[PDB]
Design a binder for these strands. Structure first.
Lengths: 72, 159, 292, 33, 172
RNA sequence: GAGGUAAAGCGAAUGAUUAGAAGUCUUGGGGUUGAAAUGACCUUAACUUAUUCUCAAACUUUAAAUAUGUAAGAAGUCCUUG
RNA sequence: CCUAAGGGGGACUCAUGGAGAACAGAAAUCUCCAGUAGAACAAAAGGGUAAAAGUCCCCUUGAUUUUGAUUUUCAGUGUGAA
RNA sequence: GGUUGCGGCCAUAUCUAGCAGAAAGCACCGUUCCCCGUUCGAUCAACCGUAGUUAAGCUGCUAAGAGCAAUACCGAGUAGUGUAGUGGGAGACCAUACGCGAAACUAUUGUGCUGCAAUCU
């Protein structure tokens, strides 16, 4: 994939850097936080993305939407 | 085609505040203005009568005339190399008392109150305000506060 | 199928009306027109004759406006009338007249304008304004405030208006809203207005219903039946009430069987109290735990 | 007899076709064929 | 509290509106108004088209329809006379989500009034607005408010009340 | 006191805009069901819900820095009364 | 451009959506609910306006008389407008 | 303390869904001779307070509620910016020096207060 982007760099003017992200895929979570929230049941799939548990709002709907949520 | 009408460029200045449209609270119509009062000018868009020109939006002046629903305010405007006194007629919806008076009027009474007491106690007191002076010496004790050593952090990319 | 309307964006940008406008009680357009004083009369307050009609009561207050809130000058209630000899029909047009007269006399006694500005002594139903006495204090000037109540010729608010005007208050008005005004021949019939002043319409109803529908008479005019009050002698009840009000309009508060503290302690018993943050946190924890 | 008329409360002073009155938006009324 | 079988929760007819939407203005509309007067004993009101539509052949402000509102016992009498024509047989999809209901007669002479060939025959829309006591809360000028959720009229309550009062069948 | 520029925002109004997911199609068609039932099924397209990527000189809840108005007393404050 | 589209007062609430009613259907009229203005306010655009400045009804001529003051453009002249 | 009338600030007050409300008040509630207004006493007007009810309105409470408000070893002294250099860089732009300094985000808390008059178990 890097070599794919390195070639793409030739089609652009200016300087571009290829950077390996610290985050899991396109999520805003670092690769260890995402694993922790996955094993804590706080993250569910939504197709090509995910949805994260909120400690806010209606309690009942929150519980139904995230069944595997190990509360602390 | 230049356009320089009366209310040109007042798209945002004469707008009502967000979630503050509609009727005017009546404390505006209950305040009493006397000749010689210091008032602030802020045009209210919902009242198109007695509206100041955009120049006077945000200016402070002296009330010199009081009429049925308005006050006459005096503003000094720079026109070239001198000031000109302008006499603006404003409905009281566009006018508010200037709060700069009250703080100074409080100091006038406060100063007199302190001064007369010093005469009573046979002492003297200095009434002039003082700018914040440099701070004096002090001793910093370190029980529970042993200094933490901080160092600059290494560069790291956070995307 | 359609966009859900009550979104969080709808709530965020909603500008709630004024507190007493959302209550549906204050018309701020009319309030602005009434309260606002000519700025060159710097601190002289305008006085409002606030007239309100409940299902069981008439309230007539004299009010001046201030930034902290309105301040009551004097007040007259319809449930004061039993002290003055009117026990029934406390929401008549004539009860309204009595309340207006009472508030007028009470305010004038509070000011000191009793010898001067006695008012219309011989209530005849003529339209008339409180005329100022030369070389003396001007009559107390009050402006009628009917709130959200609709203006109709024959309405009870103008009964309070007429009572106050006959009591010596200078309340500007035109006679085209009194019961008895002919629009086609623009003059005020004094006899019909006088009839309405002294309960003539109620007496006529008793006369008409008694000899036509006696059962409805027994159900409706019961309190008059147990009082042995006939249709003919009602006029004298209001006539004596007027004289009694003019004799002594001062305010007598009702004796209270409990102290303010006793009332507060009694009422505080039936008031639910808000939960502690800890209590509701415990409730949330219990609900989650019982959800597994 | 008197002939009262229902009073107008709407604000559309213009003279045009009503909002959301398009053709083909209807179901097939002869879908039973 | 909040007892379901309170007295004041008693459903009863608010009003009955009779609508004849004759698509033109003139003799037909005047005769329809005559029919409405005969049926109700009240002068009806003539409603105007809001916009011009060529397919329906109407223009703005042409007095198209006529209608009248009846309240009280007269509404009940007219409603039962109209339910006879429908032989006390309504459908589940004749009741709105707000608990109102309505139907339509095709020939007004079936209501039981003298037939005049000159006047002709018209169909008619009966609409019954249901409501409990305390609806004045939403209509009075001062202190106007809304009606609580329990006190609201809905489809199932209206259907049950209709069946109980009329022993009629609602074809679900 | 005044301001609406920089910045910011778009799971905030207006406008622009990428991608799926779950639903409703009952007011989208196609195919396949039926001897005829619009009553289903597979499908794409529509909408709705919760998300998602990216924007605005003539969009905006928010909102600087700099610049800008006024005041800082004897022509003042207070007390009494013509 | 307007004798109302000016003035005063009063009553009412708009765009739109949903759920319903013979002909009637995506579009006629009627009813209820929701509806912060997503409507309308002669004409550009911007601002403003909800028991109204919007829709409808009642009465009107203040779109009148006298000559001063003030604001904008500004020389602090005129004209216009306020 | 509850309630009414009139208010001040104008969501910490609004909105959704539930539950409770003693006294009083308010309210819904009843009637159409009269004044008055309507297609319609529904709204408005008048009359009774008499026949009834807290069902609703109203008030309070509940919600890991929506919204709103406030606070911050939250983000962040970041973005931006005033001033400076014969600083860097081909440029685009960037760093540094002396100053000022956000917004979103995150988290926590809160959910009307109050004036005058009257009234109340």
């Amino acid at each position: 994939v890097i070599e794919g982007l390195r070639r793409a760099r030739y089609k652009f003017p200016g300087q571009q850097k290829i950077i390996i992200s610290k985050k899991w895929g396109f999520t805003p979570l670092n690769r260890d936080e995402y694993i922790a929230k996955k094993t804590n049941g706080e993250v569910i799939d939504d197709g090509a993305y995910v949805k994260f548990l909120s400690r806010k709002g209606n309690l009942e709907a929150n519980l139904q939407q995230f069944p595997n949520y190990q509360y602390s | 085609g230049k356009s320089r009408g009366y209310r040109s460029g007042t798209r945002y200045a004469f707008q009502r505040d967000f979630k503050k449209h509609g009727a005017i609270p009546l404390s505006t119509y209950l305040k009493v203005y006397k000749v010689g009062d210091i008032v602030d000018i802020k045009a209210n868009g919902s009242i198109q009568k007695g509206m100041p020109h955009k120049y006077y939006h945000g200016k402070t002046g002296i009330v010199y005339n009081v009429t049925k629903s308005s006050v006459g305010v005096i503003i000094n405007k720079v026109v070239g190399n001198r000031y000109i006194e302008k006499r603006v007629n404003l409905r009281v919806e566009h006018v508010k008392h200037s709060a700069c008076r009250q703080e100074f009027l409080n100091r006038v009474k406060s100063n007199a109150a302190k001064k007369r007491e010093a005469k009573a106690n046979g002492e003297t007191v200095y009434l002039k305000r003082q700018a914040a002076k440099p701070r004096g010496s002090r001793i910093i004790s370190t029980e529970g506060n042993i200094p933490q050593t901080l160092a600059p952090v290494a560069y790291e990319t956070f995307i | 199928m359609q966009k859900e309307f009550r979104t969080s964006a709808y709530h965020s940008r909603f500008q709630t009306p004024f507190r007493r406008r959302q209550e549906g009680k204050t018309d701020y357009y009319q309030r602005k027109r009434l309260v606002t004083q000519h700025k060159a009369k710097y601190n002289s307050p305008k006085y409002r004759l606030v007239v309100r009609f409940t299902n069981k009561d008439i309230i007539a207050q004299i009010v001046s406006a201030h930034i902290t809130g309105d301040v009551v000058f004097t007040a007259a209630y319809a449930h004061e009338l039993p002290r003055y000899g009117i026990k029934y029909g406390l929401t008549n047009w004539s009860a309204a007249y009595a309340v207006g007269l009472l508030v007028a006399r009470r305010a004038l006694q509070k000011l000191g304008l009793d010898e001067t500005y006695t008012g219309v002594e011989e209530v005849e139903g003529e339209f008339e304004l409180t005329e100022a006495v030369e070389d003396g204090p001007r009559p107390f000037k009050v402006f009628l405030d009917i709130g959200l109540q609709r203006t109709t010729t024959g309405a009870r608010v103008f009964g309070v208006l007429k009572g106050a005007s006959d009591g010596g208050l200078y309340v500007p008005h035109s006679p085209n809203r009194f019961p008895g005004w002919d629009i086609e021949a623009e003059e005020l019939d004094a006899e019909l207005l006088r009839k309405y002043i002294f309960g003539g319409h109620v007496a006529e109803y008793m006369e008409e219903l008694l000899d036509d529908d006696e059962e409805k008479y027994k159900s409706i005019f019961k309190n008059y039946i147990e009082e042995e009050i006939e249709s003919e002698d009602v006029e004298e009840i209001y006539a004596n009430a007027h004289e009694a009000i003019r004799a002594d309009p001062s305010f007598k508060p009702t004796e209270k069987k409990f102290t303010k503290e006793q009332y507060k302690a009694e009422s505080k018993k039936y008031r639910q109290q808000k939960l502690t943050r800890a209590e509701r946190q415990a409730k949330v924890a219990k609900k989650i735990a019982e959800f597994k | 007899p008197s002939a009262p008329s229902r009073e107008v409360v709407k604000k559309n002073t213009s003279s045009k076709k009503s909002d959301a009155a398009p053709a083909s938006a209807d179901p097939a009324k002869a879908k039973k064929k | 509290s909040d007892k379901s079988q309170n007295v004041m929760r008693e459903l009863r007819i608010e009003k009955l509106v009779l609508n004849i939407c004759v698509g033109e203005s003139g003799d037909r509309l005047t005769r329809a108004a005559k029919v409405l007067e005969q049926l109700s004993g009240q002068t009806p009101v003539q409603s105007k088209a809001r916009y011009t539509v060529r397919t329906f052949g109407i223009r703005r402000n042409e007095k198209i329809a006529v209608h009248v509102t009846v309240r009280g016992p007269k509404a009940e009498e007219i409603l039962e006379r109209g339910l006879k024509v429908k032989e006390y047989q309504l459908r589940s999809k004749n009741f709105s989500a707000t608990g109102n209901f309505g139907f339509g007669i095709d020939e007004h002479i079936d209501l039981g009034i003298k037939y005049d060939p000159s006047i002709g025959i018209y169909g008619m829309d009966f609409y019954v607005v249901m409501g409990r006591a305390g609806a004045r809360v939403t209509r009075r000028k001062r202190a106007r408010s809304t009606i609580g959720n329990s006190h609201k009229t809905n489809k199932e309550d209206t259907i049950q009340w209709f069946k109980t009062r009329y022993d009629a069948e609602v074809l679900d």
